[model samples]
Target: GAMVIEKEDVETNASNGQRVDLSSELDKLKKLENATVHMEFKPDAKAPAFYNLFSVSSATKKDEYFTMAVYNNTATLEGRGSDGKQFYNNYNDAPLKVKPGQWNSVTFTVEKPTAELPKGRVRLYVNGVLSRTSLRSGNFIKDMPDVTHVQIGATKRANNTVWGSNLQIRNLTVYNRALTPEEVQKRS
Candidate 1:
């Protein structure tokens, strides 16, 4: 079984919509070294052409985080590891892109190194199709960073910038173990 994140469990702002805080829920996970996050979303017409879909923060470090965003109708995944180096993989220029007004599915997988200075791989799948893979994109840290908090439909950038808008997020789920390429391809 997997842990599901409910929309109602989150806090909201009238200007945008419900904003979720997953710190407490993620606390029970025990370990997030190889966790996988799956989500189903749709962007409304009012949704900003550029916005964040989801973000995960380190349990203890406020600045360490990973964010999946959209720009010009393209999905971008970026992160800052404990060492504070930032890296990103964006599909803005890729042939593949998200369809507006239509539902989209995404699965993000991260693996932590057993022991080393470099962390592990972070993979992104769109509509069950593998789209991006990141190994040195700031996910490389000394140890597995504890992911204690997360936000849906919103995120921060450049130290003080916050962004959000009209995004339709239907379901969010987390798996303690990383999903293989086959499993991801099978997701519907």
Candidate 2:
């Protein structure tokens, strides 16, 4: 069953290097084995080609974290597994052209490893359409050393400044379980 763990509707400006602190929900997020993150945002006209939208990191281990970002007009899901291997899933085939000043919806869903999916599965949806899918192993949240920090619009552990061009986020929601394609479509 799908359950919403966090929801934010107020429009937020994440320009410069400002980040939306979500550490208060760390406990809820740390319990997730499978999860879904959905957000609605409007990019600035001069926004950079690459920028992080959401990220979660372990407070103790800087190398252990997961990030969902936009790169070269495509949606990307990158993370480091507990085994110290890095995984990058760039959906180049399914480009998501984010028009400035217009709202866009993006959803990232991750399913834990199962018998059927030996390595687990990750799916990216753009504007209610299935954009790409990939196989990704490891349980990011549960495997982290300490899930004490979560942020939107920037990667804190990486020590990188905000790359978004005055990005405006209208809504953000997190689910404890992976959402079906239909559910993601309905939300979009």
TM-score of 1: 0.74
Q: List the residue pairs that clash in candidate 1.
A: 11-19
Q: Candidate 2 at 95: error in angstroms? A: 3.1
Q: Which ten residues in a row have the lowest lDDT in candidate 2?
A: 157-166
Query: Which regions in candidate 1 have their CA more than 4 angstroms from the true location?
Result: 2-18, 58-63, 87-95, 114-119, 137-148, 156-161
Query: Over the stretch 1-188, how does candidate 2's per-residue lDDT look in tens digits?
Result: 46655556543364435567687777877778888999888766666788777788755566667777777667676777555467545465566655555788889888998998899888888888888887856356766665467877755664443443356777888887888899899999
Model 2, global lDDT: 0.72
Worst 10 residues of 1 by lDDT: 137-146
Candidate 1 contains a number of clashing pairs equal to 1
Q: Give candidate 2 misplaced runs (Cα > 4 Å).
A: 11-16, 58-60, 82-84, 92-94, 158-165
Top candidate, metric TM-score? 2
